[PDB]
Amino acid sequence: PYHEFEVSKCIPERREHAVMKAAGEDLTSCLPKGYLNTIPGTISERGCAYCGAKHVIGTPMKDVIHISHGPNGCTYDTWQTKRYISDNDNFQLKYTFATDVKEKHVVFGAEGLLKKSMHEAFDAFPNIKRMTVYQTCTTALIGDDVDAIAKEVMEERGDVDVFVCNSPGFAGPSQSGGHHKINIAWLNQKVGTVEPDYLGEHVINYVGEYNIQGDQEVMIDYFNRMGIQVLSTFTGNGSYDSLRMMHRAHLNVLECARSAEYICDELRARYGIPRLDIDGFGFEPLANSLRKVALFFGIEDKAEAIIAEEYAKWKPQLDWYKERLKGKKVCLWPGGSKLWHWAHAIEEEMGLKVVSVYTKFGHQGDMEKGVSRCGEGALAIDDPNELESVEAIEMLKPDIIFTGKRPGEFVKKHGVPYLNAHAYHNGPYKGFEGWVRFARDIYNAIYSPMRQLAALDISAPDAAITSGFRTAKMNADLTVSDEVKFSEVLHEYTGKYDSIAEIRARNQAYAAEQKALRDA
Amino acid sequence: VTQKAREGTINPIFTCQPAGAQFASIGIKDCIGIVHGGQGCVMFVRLLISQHMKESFEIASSSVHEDGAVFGALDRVETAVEVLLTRYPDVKVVPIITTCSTEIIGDDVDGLLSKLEDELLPTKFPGREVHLLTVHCPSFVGSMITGYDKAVHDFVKKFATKDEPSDKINLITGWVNPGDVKELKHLLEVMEVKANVLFEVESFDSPLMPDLEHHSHGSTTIEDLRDTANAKGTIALNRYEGMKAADYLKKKFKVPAVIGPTPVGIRNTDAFLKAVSEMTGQPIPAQLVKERGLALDAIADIGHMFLADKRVAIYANPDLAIGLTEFCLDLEMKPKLLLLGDDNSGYVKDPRVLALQENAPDLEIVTNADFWDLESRIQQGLELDLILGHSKGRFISIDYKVPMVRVGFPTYDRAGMYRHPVLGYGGAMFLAETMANTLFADMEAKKNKEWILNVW
Amino acid sequence: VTQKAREGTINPIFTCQPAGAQFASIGIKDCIGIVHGGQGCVMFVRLLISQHMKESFEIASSSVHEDGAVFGALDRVETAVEVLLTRYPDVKVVPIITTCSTEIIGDDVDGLLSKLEDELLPTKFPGREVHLLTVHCPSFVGSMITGYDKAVHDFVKKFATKDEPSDKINLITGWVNPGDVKELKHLLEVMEVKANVLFEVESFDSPLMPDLEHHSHGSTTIEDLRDTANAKGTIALNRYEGMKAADYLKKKFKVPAVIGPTPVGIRNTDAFLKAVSEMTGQPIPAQLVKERGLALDAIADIGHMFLADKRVAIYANPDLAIGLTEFCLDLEMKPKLLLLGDDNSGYVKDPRVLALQENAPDLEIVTNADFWDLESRIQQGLELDLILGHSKGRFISIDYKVPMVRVGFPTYDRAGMYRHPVLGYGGAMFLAETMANTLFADMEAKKNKEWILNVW
Ligand code: CLF
Ligand code: CLF
């Protein structure tokens, strides 16, 4: 049934944006609305279409000048807020570009300023030959023709390539407008314009991955070990030119269907490339995904070998945390796909109880996925506002919340710990090792001795003041049995602080080897 | 003075005007602003304040979409005010901050205020004290500094009301940290001077309490703002962050205004205290001589041994950056580059900048700067020992191996920098010792005469 | 627990007993000690205190030479007392601290005191209040920790006198910084508790005044020490630096003594405040709940993101080092090595150490350690993220690229560390944030996921 919040009675439109799973209901009984306009003044969590296009999908590309046509403020506001890394020395994190539109450019036109800014950026970074121009609110209203300027700059330089993304912040209800716009733009302008140099025997496009803390590198490692060529990645750790070659892959391996399903559906409709939805998170979802990809190419035995090896290495460590986390309650509050990527896997493989999910921008498809994969009684919210979140916490009493940084700092002031669902904490959270890293983060947040200390009132007359120390393991062992506590097979996470250094230093070795053989 | 020759931006130093108006608004008790425009315009600013403070602050949006831009979006603001007021019954001040989009299309938010006060407030919130104001912040003008300056002017102009005279002064702090306000309030309390402090941002640091939840908020009240008209005088520390409000008070209510100096370092703190002493009649007491002496003893331990002849690049909010340059010169350091990151035309007329040009010989001042100014000068051969700046220039520091002291806004890559002063004598001691310790850690990382840190 | 297997020292962690007695003595107002022995025994200690504090303290020598060793050197002490008292007319307390040389040859300095008070003081300083005492500090026993502990006992035993009862408690702080004493005095003042603080070392940090020179000195008076006998109770924070004086007060004057905990971190500060509340009858007030909440909010920002699972080696003064280990365990870090740098036999029976052994799994405790313990374990493959220790272990940190937070005594390679607390809630916030910032600077120096310092 549709859940109406006490804080949202005055805005009755909010009633049909929340459901509570009930026994005897299916997807055709009730379903929260989605991808609608925001109610003004609600202090919702939603962003703008420029965010969805530029900040989320565009910037991950590693060999590109990302210049926003607009004032400095849009460019500053999205700079150094994301954790998509690259093997291009993180160029996409360290350099950001604006045309710096002033009032004279608003009144008289900013196209000359855009052309001059593009030439300046190419001049300052002569090793970069690719560029994307993003519209902002300002330059989208006044009608600047960015496409004509991009054509002029390309012909004046003769060795650069420019992509145009016309996604101003107001052009849509949330980041989702940006997802759609940039997908269709890249497909229509850029796909098919470059031919691959080498095409191996099993070629995939890895679609919908943005390399948060090295998530893509983790997945590339697995594909290398199955002998699968990743032609391009959309767009984490992705290069401009490889993404122009997407029309030549045997299979589209889609991870985030909220942000990249558009290009996948259109590549399927145009070039006949099949679309295979996968999970990167969890042990069993990731194992099944690897099995499907290897099965498509007839190389199943390679996937099974990876899976057995990874299970033997990481399953004992994951089960150490799973034993200590059984029954703990969590609120799953990302923006998009991570709510249905995690809801079932976290309950099964860490023992947590998912009491609520929400999406900031997701459509009704994300909610039908999320409601399906959640248990009965879970609260599913679309376009949540701050007061609704407070009410949900007071009703559900979660032990941890997975949400954003600023929402996390809010719920901290209501007693609850948080893990960053967006940027991770000690990521990457993808892979088999990554799931163990996620479990350790959950366990550290929940069983912190500092959390119990903060709950203690020292001015209370008979206050339970103690001395010495406690550890998280002391706190968590109070919840397990003797058989679990003295198990000789379960042990804590044995991994480096930077798990990606060794993974990246392996993907690069593989690349070198493959090049050697090919060039011979 | 060098004006940046490029027209585009590579790595901006500041954000836009609406962000500054939003930051000024969160310093007022029972105030939630509505940013009129796209949702990104408010969500990113809340994230940016969160990066600096590691706290969450309530700011609302009118959520302008495509139909709002094409058809007009004043109905969005009317809906936003109603929704915000019904759902937050403790709110008394609602500033309506415009953005680039609604400044371009010409949404008449001033006229809407009149209608709201005549129709919506008396009808659906009868007897409730609600004050609405507009802050016009076109992001293609100025920067977050000018947005902050304008918002302080707008808040004062809304509320200041002539009444019985008060012995208080007005202290407009400028854009400062909670640690800075604590230091300034300590100075005033030793001098025995009551002030209307704009703004009281110590409560930005909220405690993690056992039972009673307690969120971050500002502590400047409507009564503080109302009483600004009755003060003996106004001291605005920052000429670019509060001189407009002070000029308004002088012109409208004849409240004498003293602009600056920013009390960065020993000498400028003395000048600030002398201004307070002249305004109020209160003598500088012997306790301040002692606290000043303590800061000077710390500085003497490190000054001509470690700080003399160190080459420094500085960027911050303009007033803080200029004051930091002056303090570094007093410490015998060699400031090489000063970055003033926006297009304000008052910098070249600023008496502090004219004095820097006269007597700081190897210092280059770049107005309308971005971070590519600093980085491309290092690539061309500028050698620095130290950088003073905020966190968005951290990759220059990381990649070129120049240590940086985190000052200004935002400093998100170090823990708890908002709790330490850079103003006053306490701030001078904190600043000088942090510079020394940053340099010490760098010598040890590079093994650069690191054996010398034994009998200094 | 591992006892060091080597018999010689490579890179000692502590110095000898007389240095500890000298450090205890400089905390008393109008006290200049005479170190009975070689000139190096006093000159090096003055230099070492100077390294920590960057200040000069007056300690005298009896200047024993070859003829003073072969023949008796008690005439040197008699001359030293006369010379010191004639040339320093403000001195009231003169402790005679022995060294290794005069402990070996059996100079009877106790018997000499009787003669001095019967002959020299009444004759050549008639009516002057002069108190002489001996502190026996054979450097081939114990360490500077045991020397400090013995000197505090000796000062209390000299002066404590039964009189009218007092509502005060005795707070024997142990060997702490001026910043630590300020924090403890702040806690007591909020609790509304008066104390005889042993010692008042805030005046170690002296100001650089315009006109009247003012040198560093201690502020514990003879009256404070006299009144120790009339207190409601004694709280000795450090079991190895003040439990002997507290045991004496209980045995002699029936003053109840509470030993520990060292208030390092949140939990041990709570226990200290509860001890104060039990002793005095004074409730813990709501202001302390708020200051505790502020420290916890800072810790929550960094705890399970950056401090959890960090591998730490710790050495300091024994009580501080053990308390730091407990705080690190509460912060979810993994202490790997704890170095207790002298031969005290109480460590293995210390209930704090027994608890560490029970519930800190991967922690090795080395008693009678030197720095080669830490360094040779790193060479054999011990991996650390952080070190907590004082400055004499700096080359381990520099050469093996392990960042270090400077705690304890002496911390001479960083500026102003004596002014920051490690005790109380303020010290806990300072400690945790300094550890985070040390780690942050290290990630940037090594480019170790340094991009992660943006949205934490
Ligand atoms: S320069 Fe400044 S931050 Fe930019 S829009 Fe303008 S006021 Fe705002 Fe806003 S919604 Fe997104 S972030 Fe922009 S494209 Fe518009
Ligand atoms: S005059 Fe010179 S420094 Fe003095 S002892 Fe003699 S050789 Fe040495 Fe040594 S151990 Fe300590 S510091 Fe002394 S009391 Fe003995």
How does this structure look, described?
- The structure is cut from a larger assembly and holds 1 copy of chain A (520 residues) and 2 copies of chain B (456 residues).
- In chain A, helix 1 crosses helix 8, helix 5 packs parallel to helix 7 and helix 12 runs antiparallel to helix 13.
- The N and C termini of chain A lie far apart (65 Å).
- The longest helix of chain A is centred in the middle third of the chain and has 26 residues.
- A 6-stranded mixed beta sheet of chain A has the order 1-12-11-10-13-14, sandwiched between helices. A 4-stranded parallel beta sheet of chain A has the order 3-2-4-5, sandwiched between helices.
- Chain A is an alpha/beta fold.
- Chain B has 456 residues and is of the alpha/beta class.
- Chain B is 46% helix and 12% strand.
- Chain B is built from 17 helices and 15 strands.
- Chain B has a 6-stranded parallel beta sheet with strand order 1-13-12-11-14-15, sandwiched between helices. In chain B, strands 4-3-5-6 form a 4-stranded parallel beta sheet, sandwiched between helices.
- Chain B is globular, with a radius of gyration of 23 Å.
- The chains are: A alpha/beta (520), B alpha/beta (456).
- Chains A and C meet through helix 18, helix 19 and helix 20 of A and helix 11, helix 12, helix 13 and helix 14 of C.
- The complex binds FE(8)-S(7) cluster (2 copies).
- One FE(8)-S(7) cluster sits at the interface of chains A and B.
- Chains B, C: It is an enzyme of class 1 (oxidoreductase).
- Chains B, C: One of its GO terms (molecular function) is nitrogenase activity.
- Chains B, C: Belongs to the NifD/NifK/NifE/NifN family.
What are the main properties of this structure?
part of a larger assembly; 3 chains; A: 520 residues; alpha/beta; four-stranded parallel sheet; 14 strands; B: 456 residues; six-stranded parallel sheet; binds FE(8)-S(7) cluster; Nase/OxRdtase_comp1 (chain A); EC 1.18.6.1 (chain A)
